[model samples]
Target: TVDFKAPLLPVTCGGVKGILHKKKLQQGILVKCIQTEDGKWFTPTEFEIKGGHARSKNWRLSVRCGGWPLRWLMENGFLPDPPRIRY
Candidate 1:
């Protein structure tokens, strides 16, 4: 059995922050969700990390999500656009 009442720490990417939840199943892909500061929730798209070498300062983070949470993050400067060229 799983405990739904378990406390979870908040997760932050860039300037956006939320509480992440993980779900398990007998057989299937795992599930996840994010609870925003506005008391709303959303599921995040597959998070990706691209480029960069060990001990290097070149890396990028990519993610996608629908609704006002995503829009608000971008519009308020919490999330930045992809670089013009790979670093």
Candidate 2:
């Protein structure tokens, strides 16, 4: 723990980082973490889904969603699945 200051994060290739806060693990322990160089650690975790983006305006929730169907579709079908309006 440290004093709160008028802290200004350094810019790394237009990227910024900072500490979020401590989190309680499953074992009920507080863990400290710092932001990543890519301004992540605060951003949503992106993993390719069937060409469908998991990202949304809400960052926390965006990370909550685990998409695998997209990958499955890509494997079984193709990257850009043909758009079909099956009525």
Candidate 3:
């Protein structure tokens, strides 16, 4: 029973502002594509919680179908690295 009530954070990528939503799930966290301030959308992706505890800040999020949006997330410090993707 981990707390998944963390607040959504604001993100700016490719000069567009958007909201980053981390939805709670039974098995892992669900991160969908981001919608920009100007009504633009990015490719949908997922980051499953693979390692670490829910109460730990060192928890890891494994990426799935990550695209430009995920790249931006990593670049802005919203996520960690080791699984890098080519632009």
Q: TM-score: which is higher, 1 or 3?
A: 1
The CA lDDT of each predicted structure is 0.37, 0.26, 0.36
Candidate 2 residue lDDT tens string, 1-87? 222221322111112223333231111212222255444443212211111333333222222112322233235432222233357
Question: Model 3 shows how many backbone clashes?
Answer: 0
Model 2 worst lDDT window (10 residues): 24-33
List the lowest-lDDT window of 10 residues for candidate 3. 44-53
Whole-model lDDT, model 2: 0.26
lDDT of 1 by residue, 4-77 (tens): 23444344444455564533111121233556688765434322111112233222222323223333444654
Backbone clash tally (model 2): 2
Error of 2 at 38 (Å): 6.9
Q: Return the candidate ranking by TM-score, descending.
A: 1, 3, 2
Winner of 1 and 2 under TM-score: 1
Query: RMSD for each model, in Å, please?
Result: 14.7, 16.3, 13.3
Query: Pick by lDDT: which candidate is best?
Result: 1
